[PDB]
């Protein structure tokens, strides 16, 4: 699996889970959240060589096609597999509001 | 929708369904297969700008992060959405065998 356990403990130029901490105010311009100040969103990046973490039959075939003919630009792409929610806290005046924002964090990757 | 109807009828530099024909013997080295000799597999390629055909909350957020900080290389990727199977014919000696291989053709795209 292309998760934290493998990806963060090993060097890889191929499709892997990459660490990313997104700051609400600094990075996105979101000034409304009280807590957290940012989050470990993470992202998926890296090469998709032949039979490396293929999603579908199409991904398997194109990982092969792109080995033979790179020029076609038909390579599978390094993308999200398992996503997790983020719990945030914001205020409406003195009123605290807790929201679970779904699919905010990427936990693993796939070549699609 | 990033399908044949839109993508093949219009020029697009952002994430779109691109045409691609795969010849089995030529492009993959599959000599075991009798029919077809190849197929219109297609692929997904193109830029993933802010909000362009965004899959999940994570892709919405990253299209935004990558608009602000392109340097991080954290852009969403142009990938398959809807796929179709491909019916093949192959021989085991004299015996003809009809097989359905699923998710062989990409019909629509998304930014993930």
């Amino acid at each position: 699996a292309l998760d934290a356990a493998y990806c963060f403990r090993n060097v890889q130029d191929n499709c892997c889970l990459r660490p990313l901490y997104i700051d609400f105010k600094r990075d996105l311009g979101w000034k409304w959240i009280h807590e957290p100040k940012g989050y470990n969103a993470n992202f998926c990046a890296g090469a998709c060589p032949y039979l490396w973490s293929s999603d579908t039959q199409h991904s398997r075939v194109l990982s092969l096609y792109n080995t033979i003919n790179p020029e076609a630009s038909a390579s599978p792409c390094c993308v999200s597999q398992d996503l997790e929610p983020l719990t945030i806290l914001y205020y409406i005046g003195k009123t605290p509001k807790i929201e679970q924002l779904s699919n905010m964090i990427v936990k693993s990757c796939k070549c699609s | 929708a990033l399908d044949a109807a839109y993508c093949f009828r219009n020029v697009q530099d952002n994430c779109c369904l691109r045409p691609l024909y795969i010849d089995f013997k030529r492009d993959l080295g599959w000599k075991w297969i009798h029919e077809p000799k190849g197929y219109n597999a297609n692929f997904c390629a193109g830029a993933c700008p802010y909000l362009w055909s965004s899959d999940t909350q994570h892709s919405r957020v990253l299209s935004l992060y990558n608009t602000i900080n392109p340097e991080a290389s954290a852009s969403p990727c142009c990938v398959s959405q809807d796929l179709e199977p491909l019916t093949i014919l192959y021989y085991i000696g004299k015996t003809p065998k009809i097989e359905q291989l699923s998710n062989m053709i990409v019909k629509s795209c998304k930014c993930s």
Partner: antibody
Amino acid sequence: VQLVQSGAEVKKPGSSVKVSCKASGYTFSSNVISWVRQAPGQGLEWMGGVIPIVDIANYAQRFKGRVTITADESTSTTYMELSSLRSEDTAVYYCASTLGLVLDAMDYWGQGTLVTVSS
Amino acid sequence: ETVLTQSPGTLSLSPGERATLSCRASQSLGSSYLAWYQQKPGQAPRLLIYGASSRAPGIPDRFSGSGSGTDFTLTISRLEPEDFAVYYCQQYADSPITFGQGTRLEIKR
């Protein structure tokens, strides 16, 4: 940076009105958009707001059940829909972006939209 | 809901003078949850002060605010004839946001 609102409207009582507000630039993705009305009678009244991308809308009690505030991020446009219109709903409707929080000071305002509620 | 009482209702002063507008709240608003607006005829309200004392971007230095709890003040130190307007106070300490009834400021000539 500019907020451009839809034109004036006349609406029969019991009807509903959808007022638009288009934002110039890449500020839609980052700001809370508030809706405020002003009638000669009741004066300035906050109606509610919407947080974009996450699409959380919050309403003032006196309006909860009649108002809908939506954000079409594709057109960078916010919509306000007020239903079961009564004569007391005759006012100038403004969209404004807040300084940061859901309840905050509002720096950018639209030109305003006059909604007349009459038979 | 918090009630904001503005006083006086009307005020006419001459250029060069100082205007003192008052906002009195039905409950404490702290010190960072009050804004002042200027509204000219046929226009939308213009943010002057936020968080009881901070001047909003591009606002002239002659506008100033102060206060805490229930008593807030807007001050226009050297009135210009262009200072004629309706001034409103707004609280954002407690839901829902509430505004004051307004103070009309006339500029003597």
